Amino acid sequence: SDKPKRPLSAYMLWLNSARESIKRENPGIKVTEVAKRGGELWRAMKDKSEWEAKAAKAKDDYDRAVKEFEANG
């Protein structure tokens, strides 16, 4: 397999689910101003338990899969 979905922060998972809808509604906003606004929708949407818990899942499928990813010496 290739590089597995590395584990990250919850606010990040949502950042990926809104990265496309973020640059669209935004004027090609810079990556530095993309996080300042991404923090408003993140806490203005529903909650974090969605992504946060989701990160754990990648964790299990990440420690076990990375091995396969690292077994390509």
Length of the chain: 73
Side-chain-facing half-sphere of 29: CA atoms under 13 Å: 16
DSSP at 27: T
- Rounded Cα distance, 13 and 19, in Å: 10
- Rounded Cα distance, 63 and 46, in Å: 29
CATH 3.20.20.70 describes domain 1-73: no
Residue type, 43: R
- Rounded Cα distance, 7 and 55, in Å: 6
- Rounded Cα distance, 51 and 56, in Å: 9
Contact (Cβ atoms closer than 8 angstroms) between residue 38 and residue 58:
no
Tokens matching residue 29: 């906003």
**Measured between alpha carbons, how far is residue 68 from residues 11, 34, 48, 54 in Å?**
27, 34, 30, 21
Contact (Cβ atoms closer than 8 angstroms) between residue 13 and residue 54:
yes
